[PDB]
Ligand binder design. Structure first.
Ligand SMILES: NC(=O)c1ccc[n+]([C@@H]2O[C@H](COP(=O)([O-])OP(=O)(O)OC[C@H]3O[C@@H](n4cnc5c(N)ncnc54)[C@H](O)[C@@H]3O)[C@@H](O)[C@H]2O)c1
Ligand SMILES: NC(=O)c1ccc[n+]([C@@H]2O[C@H](COP(=O)([O-])OP(=O)(O)OC[C@H]3O[C@@H](n4cnc5c(N)ncnc54)[C@H](O)[C@@H]3O)[C@@H](O)[C@H]2O)c1
Ligand SMILES: Cc1cn([C@H]2C[C@H](O)[C@@H](COP(=O)(O)OP(=O)(O)O[C@H]3O[C@H](CO)[C@@H](O)[C@H](O)[C@H]3O)O2)c(=O)[nH]c1=O
Ligand SMILES: Cc1cn([C@H]2C[C@H](O)[C@@H](COP(=O)(O)OP(=O)(O)O[C@H]3O[C@H](CO)[C@@H](O)[C@H](O)[C@H]3O)O2)c(=O)[nH]c1=O
Lengths: 347, 346
């Protein structure tokens, strides 16, 4: 690795911790400093095993300029995962999204500019808004613009996706105006070990394990492009070390599936009746379909996803939450209670 | 269809002109200006018309408590408040992040709370830039050779990116919360009351002050000029007849490169064609801006009245000439500020 001392913000979260583990296991010459605020989503247990001389955990806010400047001064790269990442929380209270996603990114960019160090912005495909279902597209999803590409127009639907898109925009502006050495990645829905139980797949799995019925927003026709967090990690690493400055790369593993189909699979794999779940209040402004065309990343950086078998990936994920119930058991009640405030069983 | 509107940034250039427009053509509407009076805010821009129709409240749009107090008594918010200079955004972006994004967010929440009309005044800079006409197959008249409502966002600077970012949350607030918002992206405004840090006023007042006009590089950059008066009627049309959630582009089809604009100014002011200095070019400088305002024209019937730039510029030059006391106290400071980052090319 060309970078020997990197800072990984949000490294105590789901995707970020997976990345830190990836770096620890595949790039031993890299020292990692994780800067994480440890919000409801941050969990030290996600990093505990590897904390030591190679990985340090610094508890703080990415909006804390003084702290960021102290860390940035000793780093040669920043991989930025820190963010409020739940659409449902953003619709309930946008405040933290404004602070962390936009002001936080801005604070990091100024540090990167000050020390002139590499900067990789980790973002989402949600900045592009949503797409119609394949059955309603003239190209069945295979035509131009029927999937997201690096040229797709930004059109975020929620406080969450809009603040992320907003962060993406200043990153690009900092590149053009100040010459900041940044790259951006927008990837599809990640799934796998360590995902907070507030998220779709982990919520259904743990709900079942906890004797609670899974929850499906509306009829569950919405489509998401699933990718295993492990492939997201290798994608980010490829962009970080070989990406073209100022460029955006889309990360996806061509795994489109509707929520209903995913939930049924979970129920089936966990030996539960097909209708053993509840339809609940649909999400306001809910995005219909997400789909990523990762040709640029594949073709230009030689990256390829290894976990293309969703059924198998999901199987392993269900097994993980089953063998690690102590990891989430104490959060179940609060999470569901929070959802009860805005979600009710509809028809 | 609104009687008590809040006009943020109403003590500035475009905003104050909008206030004058409402004062003159809609005397039944009460206007409450919320302006922080930064280096760009000027009471003189409103002093003559302050009264029963117009009141000035000095404050920050990021001041949630103040905004809530005012929003509780309004039926609409026309949002002009912003840090508007690219060059200042390059020297210190902090106020841009604060006012343009946090400020807009603060206003959106107030609009959401009271469920009132919100019109976001924005810029064509959110789309990034375009190649010169000479380098386009359609010579600027072909598809994608001008900005449209479908053009993707691609801001080049802290200023344009914070504006674009604000446009994005405005739209998200419409989709997610049903906020009654509309957005407008306008090309370069010019006319009376524009701060002398801006291109046209700067050249005009420099000549009046016996100072050399300043041209970035060789002046190849293209701007689509529109008189602020046409921008005012555009915003009014959108505010009163626009469709919720829609974005409208405002432009008068007046593309000109900086060099020819400066030359016209020199000519009109009796100065030699070469009596100016080339100065340090702007980092990440946007090449060409061009607006296709077909949507606004087609759907709302808006038609620009000041399409004769030569005549518009002449009157603008005359205004700065007739109102030198309005800008003289700032000339030295503005030129001294520029000197910190710009020098004559030689
Ligand atoms: N979940 C997904 O599928 C997904 C897919 C694509 C892109 N992304 C992006 O990937 C990144 C990580 O996503 P995630 O799912 O792992 O989120 P997460 O909710 O699991 O974790 C977010 C992490 O950031 C930390 N954090 C929050 N605010 C902070 C602040 N102000 N300062 C420092 N740390 C702060 C939290 O404590 C937590 O560890 C985000 O930027 C997200 O937008 C997420
Ligand atoms: N100048 C142009 O050609 C132009 C063209 C298109 C769009 N726009 C947009 O039009 C709007 C007005 O532009 P302008 O040229 O008149 O700008 P300006 O610099 O002349 O004035 C900005 C005004 O906002 C006020 N302001 C700044 N920060 C504030 C805050 N935090 N709270 C309250 N008031 C604050 C200033 O005091 C000032 O009166 C902006 O949103 C700008 O992005 C400008
Ligand atoms: C929590 C939950 C979710 N859903 C649905 C809503 C969505 O269509 C789908 C997935 O929802 P979520 O897990 O919240 O993920 P989603 O909104 O798609 O966004 C995720 O993926 C994005 C990238 O695609 C990231 O940027 C976000 O940070 C991340 O949270 O499942 C349900 O039906 N029931 C539930 O209980
Ligand atoms: C101040 C100054 C500017 N210029 C050039 C740079 C630009 O190409 C052009 C106009 O510069 P400015 O007056 O700063 O305007 P510009 O950057 O185009 O942006 C304006 O127009 C935008 C909309 O197009 C607004 O959003 C901005 O708030 C407004 O300031 O003239 C010079 O050549 N010399 C100068 O002294």
């Amino acid at each position: 690795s060309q970078f020997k001392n990197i800072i990984v913000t949000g490294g105590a979260g789901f995707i970020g911790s997976n990345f830190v583990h990836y770096v620890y296991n595949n790039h031993p010459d890299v020292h990692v400093t994780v800067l994480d605020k440890l919000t409801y989503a941050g969990n030290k247990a996600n990093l505990e095993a590897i904390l030591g001389d190679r990985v340090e955990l610094v508890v703080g806010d990415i909006a804390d300029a003084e702290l960021v400047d102290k860390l940035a001064a000793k780093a040669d790269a920043i991989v930025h995962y820190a963010a409020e990442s739940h659409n449902d929380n953003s619709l309930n209270d946008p405040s933290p999204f404004i602070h962390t996603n936009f002001i936080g990114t801005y604070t990091l960019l100024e540090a990167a500019r000050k020390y002139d160090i590499r900067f990789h912005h980790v973002s989402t495909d949600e900045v592009y808004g949503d797409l119609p279902l394949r059955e309603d597209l003239p190209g069945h999803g295979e035509g131009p613009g029927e999937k997201f590409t690096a040229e797709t127009n930004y059109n975020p639907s929620s406080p969450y996706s809009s603040t992320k898109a907003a962060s993406d925009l200043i990153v690009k502006a900092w590149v053009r105006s100040f010459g900041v050495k940044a790259t951006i990645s927008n990837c599809s829905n990640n799934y796998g070990p360590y995902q907070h139980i507030e998220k779709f797949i982990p919520r259904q799995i743990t709900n079942i394990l906890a004797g609670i019925k899974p929850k499906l927003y509306g009829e569950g026709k919405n489509v998401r492009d699933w990718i295993h967090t492990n492939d997201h990690s290798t994608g980010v690493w490829a962009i970080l070390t070989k990406g073209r400055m100022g460029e955006t790369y889309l990360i996806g593993a061509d795994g489109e599936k509707n929520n209903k189909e995913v939930l049924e699979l979970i129920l089936e794999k966990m030996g539960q009746p097909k209708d053993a779940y509840d339809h609940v209040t649909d999400r306001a402004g809910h995005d219909l379909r997400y789909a990523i065309d990762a040709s640029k990343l594949r073709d230009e950086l030689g990256w390829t996803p290894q976990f293309t078998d969703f059924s198998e990936g999901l199987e392993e994920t269900i097994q993980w939450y089953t063998d690690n119930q102590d990891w989430w058991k104490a959060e179940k009640e609060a999470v569901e209670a929070n959802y009860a405030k805005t979600q009710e069983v509809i028809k």
